[PDB]
């Protein structure tokens, strides 16, 4: 039931979740665990959390109207990370690496 | 063609390669890349490298005679990491976390 574009988006998502990128993608696999990380202000600063497991369930649920909504969620995920953390944080470097993977594959969508 | 024991060992290997443990297991997914990491002495100190992809190909190749040979390779992987790196290194903490997963599942083998 997926468009040609969202089928391509689903393949981007599968790649971002693959062991190939695990070294920098793993903090985004699941929702940020503010409880385990003791980040008592995380849900005050980040009003709309996002992560790859959430993007996957929405894609599998056929909840994205077009490829543009898929991209908006992925970039929200990266944006929340840049918003919450100091620019020198290692998770910010990991987000930028994974975002480089995303933007490159997304731009090359036929 | 696998024993009941090595079938259980194969399930341990599948778990160690799952996204569940990726945060600390990813440096062991593939052989240590001394070229990319510029570790010009790595193959002088580590005479017998080992990693999870190598354990997997041996298991798939039916190259382990028993569960004891499987365990010897997994512990070689951890041992090489403790041998090469300083004890305070983050990859040593990651090895100990993954080894805790391994030893616990291995000990509970029926």
């Amino acid at each position: 039931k997926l468009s040609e574009h969202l089928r391509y988006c689903d393949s981007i998502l599968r790649e971002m979740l693959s062991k190939k990128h695990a070294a920098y993608a793993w903090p985004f696999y699941k929702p940020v665990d503010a409880e385990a990380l003791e980040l008592h202000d995380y849900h005050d600063i980040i009003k709309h959390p996002m992560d790859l497991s959430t993007v996957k369930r929405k894609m599998d649920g056929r909840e994205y109207p077009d490829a543009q909504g898929f991209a908006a969620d992925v970039r929200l995920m990266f944006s929340n990370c840049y918003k919450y953390n100091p620019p020198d944080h290692e998770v910010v470097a990991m987000a930028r690496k994974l975002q480089d993977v995303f933007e490159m594959r997304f731009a090359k969508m036929p | 063609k696998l024993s009941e024991h090595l079938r259980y060992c194969d399930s341990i290997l599948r778990e160690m390669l799952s996204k569940k443990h990726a945060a600390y297991a990813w440096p062991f997914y593939k052989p240590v890349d001394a070229e990319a990491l510029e570790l010009h002495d790595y193959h002088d100190i580590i005479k017998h490298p080992m990693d999870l992809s190598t354990v997997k190909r041996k298991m798939d190749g039916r190259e382990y005679p028993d569960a004891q040979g499987f365990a010897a390779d997994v512990r070689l992987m951890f041992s090489n990491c403790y041998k090469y790196n300083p004890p305070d290194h983050e990859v040593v903490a990651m090895a100990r976390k993954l080894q805790d997963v391994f030893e616990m599942r291995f000990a509970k083998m029926p």
Binding site: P27, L37, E38, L39, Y84, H89 | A23, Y24, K97
Partner: peptide
């Protein structure tokens, strides 16, 4: 108050 990644596990 800073996020510590290893504290996730």
């Amino acid at each position: 108050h800073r996020x510590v990644l290893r504290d996730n596990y």
